[PDB]
């Protein structure tokens, strides 16, 4: 009787995976197109992350046995999706964190930082938010993600440890600014770039409306603002919303956080002199993050452009050959240079020291199911493509005409944050923007006023870990769970809306004369 | 004194990483040019395997820092080589074999087999020689591979711990016959359909002379006499060349072996009825082996060609969605499925059983570093192809016909045979094909005649890890060094061209009247 309401709770992720595609067939039959054929396969693997039934990487294996059994795309093309180019900048950067982390490397920076920011709660993660934001303005964001991920880490690992949510709360904003950061320079992303090639290839006479120093003055003061709203979101979810007890002030706080400060003051001042492998590993530390800015910086000319050129003049070296050639190095140097020691077999012979990193530690310490979910990302993008149904959606944002003009630029903001969560950013832009020029020119609408919002939306990813990698990327320690990331990011893909509908309709009328429709977007059908 | 030259010996790992991209430099600068850049990252590779400087996944990374700082290829377009259709081949292969090792069906196994053949050396290689090479006649020598060197290891292990050079011995020869019994088949494997396609493309009017009667009449006389040389020079190599030690004849071999055997059948008669575990194990390995043999079997039709077809008529679904396919069922299956354990924490409610595989155990077993190497060899040969390499060596070919006509065959089989431990068998076979029929119809020659050595030539592939995806397979344990494989598979390289070169004298000339130039061979320019 009452056993069966207690049996039937543990057996909760069976029965998900034995009746949600049963549940959603529906779908595949009684509309039978190829396009409902992919809607099905990502209903179906967002319901298998949140109610987390299977593991993470084996929800990501599904496009290899649904995209072929469903006519989509071959079994070997949907294969070679897996192991792009940003999974190897996440697999060299991670060669480094191992490295990092063996040689307790992340006892020192994480006791040094925690000696100038101080233990609150509050304040050190606006500190983490601030330099995670700053990075990400100048190099990838799946650089940045790769290199802060851990050392925010290690600093929750020494804070914890030397007090006797917010752990979730720590993990987020790394994930979060490394992608809202991003939008505040126009080599700072992906779709950044493609505005500007969509505007000088669509309307030829535009003069150049769209460079480095006018994005900036636009989207900067957009960056800050939801940089700032999302910090005050973060908190009141996941910490408390006393506001008192986060910034620590008043009495009983004093009392624990004086008595915390000094066991740190006390654990820095033992681990003296460095040794020779923490010599060599933090300053391939800064070689690594020095040939990330100088690559191919965009407002100056890198090495990568010097040297390296290919047809066109742009790089073949891109951050991820920076990152392996880095963790190949890590097996080539060795950890205590004059190490001669004795071999217990053979007393004889010697024998030599380790390297900097060796195999038996890096298949231990590898998160080796992030490097397949991360696939799963690009192959679920890809099969989108295939398809047609991001062509799909694209034609039905066109009669969206008969709607006064400030809301056109929300509602198009709200599809574009939605469906971008499914698929990649650089696919959307590429593939939605021709179609809103060609909206914007009938209606007697400047462009970038729907255009600019469409290339601001891409970038606020916040809900599934398959858009924007820096959110996979935060699962590498499993202390999260994709509810919890599935939690946060719906209200923030809202706050983010209402942030660019407000930077569109002030400070961004008079730097683009929004309200004009100028002489460079006339045509021979408009008038 | 003396001990410079101690230390020096233990450093020998270090000194061969650099001074050997020292000695190697006249290559990319005396002659400078993209096929000569290609030529010096195949020689760098091949020899840091055999000497064993790095661990055999860092050397495969090197494509991805080599290809794009010379120019062959962009890093983008090197990146997509790692991850493909037969990388997942062996990853949902041995997903099956982490489930089988975990419930301890791998003690069944072994246990039944050495009850069957008996504890002696040589029969039991032949035993595993013979049903290795009969299975890759009819499947991908992927699929063999990845099932039966997992069986292969759990033999040896109960082998040598019932008795208190052999595990080398026995991993080459599931190696071995892998790719040398897929070739009595057209079906067997990839460049024997490349021949049916080239000949029916170049002379449209040959009548259908290669097809499957008539391939099977000439290649599998040449397996089993290749097959029974490469069981010979295996035993002569690893295991001594008594030949009564071997086959355990004669007093003192008996004494052993009798009380070796009576361990065995002690060992077998406890472990007694089998677990809920070991039931959908076994039953979900049958049919993982049924699905292979009747998917795309060629001599009729499977259930590939008749749900999932593509335009032309192929599958979409491949060996490796089966793969994928019955190790995420594994996921989902109870292990013992009315398991209503209790929980410490909150005792309350109740505990869910475990699945037949979790990801904390795959994750510890899975050879990760085989999911490199393996990549690494496809994009070793892919920049093969993107320099001209194949493209400049097929063009030396053509001057090699002022040579007597039988001795063209044995040439020809000796450049392909070592060309083909660098790049791929599909790729080329489809360069150089065209070019020997060229060759043959300027001096009266018939094709198929330096055709037909061309194509089984790429089939003798047993030096270097990169050629026929399974000479990496049998790295998964560790057991072995890539120095022990070059050392037999060089003179099995000149074994199997001198065995090619007596089929295509005898018993090659009746059946295909290779003495007459016949009339589908004339062209405008002959006579
Ligand atoms: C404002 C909050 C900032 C929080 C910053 C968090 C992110 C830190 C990223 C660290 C990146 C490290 C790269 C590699 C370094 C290799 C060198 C190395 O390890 O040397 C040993 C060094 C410790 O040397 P030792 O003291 O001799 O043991 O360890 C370090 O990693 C150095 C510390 C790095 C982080 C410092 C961050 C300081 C930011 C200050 C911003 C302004 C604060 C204003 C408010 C307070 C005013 C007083
Ligand atoms: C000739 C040498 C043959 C050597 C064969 C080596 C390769 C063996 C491949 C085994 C593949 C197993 C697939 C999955 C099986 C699931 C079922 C299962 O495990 O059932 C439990 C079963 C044991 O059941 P139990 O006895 O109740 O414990 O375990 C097995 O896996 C069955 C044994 C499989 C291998 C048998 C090979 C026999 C070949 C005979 C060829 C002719 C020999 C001529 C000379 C001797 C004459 C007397
Ligand atoms: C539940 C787990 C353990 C196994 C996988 C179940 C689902 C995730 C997938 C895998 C195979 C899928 C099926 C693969 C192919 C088809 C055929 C498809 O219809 C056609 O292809 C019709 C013919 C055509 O128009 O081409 C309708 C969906 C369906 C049944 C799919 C329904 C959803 C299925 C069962
Ligand atoms: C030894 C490990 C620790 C680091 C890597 C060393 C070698 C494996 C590789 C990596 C980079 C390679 C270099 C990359 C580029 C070039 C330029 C190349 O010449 C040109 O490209 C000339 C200009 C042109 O014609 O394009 C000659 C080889 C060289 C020096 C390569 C020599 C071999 C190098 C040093
Ligand atoms: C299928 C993919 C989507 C998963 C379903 C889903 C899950 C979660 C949410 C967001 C809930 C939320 O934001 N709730 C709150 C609001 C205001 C204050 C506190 C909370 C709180 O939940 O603590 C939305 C949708
Ligand atoms: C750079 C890639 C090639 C590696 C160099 C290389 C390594 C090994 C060999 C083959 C040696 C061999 O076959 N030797 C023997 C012959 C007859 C009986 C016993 C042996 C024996 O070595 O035990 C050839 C070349």
Redesign the pocket.
Known sequence: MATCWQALWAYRSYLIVFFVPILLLPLPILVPSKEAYCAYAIILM??FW?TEALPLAVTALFPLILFPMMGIVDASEVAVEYLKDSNLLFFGGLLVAIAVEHWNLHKRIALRVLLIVGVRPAPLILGFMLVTAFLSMWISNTATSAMMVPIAHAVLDQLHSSQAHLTQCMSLCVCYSASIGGIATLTGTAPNLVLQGQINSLFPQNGNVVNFASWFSFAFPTMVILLLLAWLWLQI?FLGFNFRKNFGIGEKMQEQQQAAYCVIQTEHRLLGPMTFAEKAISILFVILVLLWFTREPGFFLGWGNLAFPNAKGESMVSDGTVAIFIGIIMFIIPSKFPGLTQDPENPGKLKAPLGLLDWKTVNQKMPWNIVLLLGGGYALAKGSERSGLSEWLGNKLTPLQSVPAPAIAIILSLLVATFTECTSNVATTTIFLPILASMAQAICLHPLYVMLPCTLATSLAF?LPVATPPNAIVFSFGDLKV?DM??AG??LNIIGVLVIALAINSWGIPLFSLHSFPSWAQSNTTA
Chains 1, 2 share one sequence.
Do not use: D, E
Request: glycine share 0%.
């Open positions: 967002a319901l949140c979810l809900m509810l599935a939690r719906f209200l």
